[PDB]
Amino acid sequence: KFCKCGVRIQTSAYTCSKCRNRSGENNSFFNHKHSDITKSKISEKMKGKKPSNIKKISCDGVIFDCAADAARHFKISSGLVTYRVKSDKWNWFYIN
DNA sequence: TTTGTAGGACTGCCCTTTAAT
DNA sequence: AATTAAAGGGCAGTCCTACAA
Ligand SMILES: [Zn+2]
């Protein structure tokens, strides 16, 4: 049997693995909901990590891995970090 | 039988902006 | 002006499941 893309697939295969739509309603887990257990599991394994979208910062010399560390260190809200980094009154900038 | 797959369904952690003080 | 709690918007890592192999 031949697949819509042209390659030969098993008579039972609805499409080659390469043509298989897995987006939206086509995903095998589409419209499903996760249990409180699964949620809890995921939760535990994500604890301790840092997202890829952090920004190294330098507080007039003292550098941190992310704004949150800068905030937790100075003991301020994360929004105030943003404020200062933009204020001309502070020497706070995000590192390359 | 078993395995691989990819995106849906989620998470922690993150950054910014807004309201309200 | 200075500050913060929430709401807005993000990202890769985890789980989960039907289907090709
Ligand atoms: Zn195909």
Side-chain angles (χ1 to χ4, degrees), chain A residues 3-7 9 15-19:
Chain A
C3 171
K4 78 173 185 300
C5 77
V7 307
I9 49 174
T15 324
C16 81
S17 86
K18 184 59 192 65
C19 295

Side-chain angles (χ1 to χ4, degrees), chain A residues 11-24:
Chain A
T11 86
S12 34
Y14 183 62
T15 324
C16 81
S17 86
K18 184 59 192 65
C19 295
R20 176 173 179 177
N21 203 306
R22 300 160 164 267
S23 301

Side-chain angles (χ1 to χ4, degrees), chain A residues 22-74:
Chain A
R22 300 160 164 267
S23 301
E25 51 175 24
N26 303 292
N27 198 272
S28 301
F29 195 72
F30 170 65
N31 262 180
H32 287 235
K33 281 300 175 166
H34 281 305
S35 57
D36 289 42
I37 290 184
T38 302
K39 289 185 189 179
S40 166
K41 294 189 170 187
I42 304 170
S43 178
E44 292 308 300
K45 286 211 178 181
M46 291 310 286
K47 280 168 172 182
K49 299 182 161 159
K50 266 191 164 54
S52 72
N53 64 286
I54 51 189
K55 292 185 186 176
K56 283 191 193 170
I57 192 176
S58 180
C59 306
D60 180 55
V62 178
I63 72 175
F64 302 86
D65 288 322
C66 49
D69 289 338
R72 281 189 293 269
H73 176 70
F74 289 65

Side-chain angles (χ1 to χ4, degrees), chain A residues 60 75-76:
Chain A
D60 180 55
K75 291 285 171 33
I76 52 174

